[PDB]
């Protein structure tokens, strides 16, 4: 084999963030899409908005694009949280 194109990003939010502002979810989604567009063609972008670990997945067209994304985002700060970015393990669901 698998040449991984999917990036799993964590700690981007906590689901309570969307409890009292119905606009934050779409703002975070767009923030991520705009940034990730610089790394490669996005095939699919998902926010797991009820996952307690603040998870998003970004699928790219090429594995090099996923690599560039992981290199740039892992350990970066987002909205006051330090995020992780890693290649999908191919098994875990969110």
């Amino acid at each position: 084999m698998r040449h991984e194109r999917v990036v799993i990003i964590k700690n981007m939010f906590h689901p309570m963030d969307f409890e009292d502002d119905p606009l934050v979810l779409n703002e975070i989604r767009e923030d991520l899409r705009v940034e990730c567009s610089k790394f490669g063609q996005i095939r699919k972008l998902l926010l797991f908005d009820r996952h307690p670990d603040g998870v998003a997945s970004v699928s790219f067209r090429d594995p090099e694009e996923a690599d560039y994304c992981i290199q740039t985002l892992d350990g970066r700060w987002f909205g006051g949280r330090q995020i992780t970015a890693q290649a999908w393990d191919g098994t875990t669901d969110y």
Partner: peptide, 7 residues
């Protein structure tokens, strides 16, 4: 955007 915002 929220990129690079610290606590």
């Amino acid at each position: 955007n929220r990129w690079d915002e610290t606590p």
